[PDB]
Design a protein around this ligand. Sequence first.
Ligand SMILES: [Zn+2]
Length: 6
Amino acid sequence: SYSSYG
Ligand SMILES: [Zn+2]
């Protein structure tokens, strides 16, 4: 999984 906030 890949999650990015920013
Ligand atoms: Zn950004």
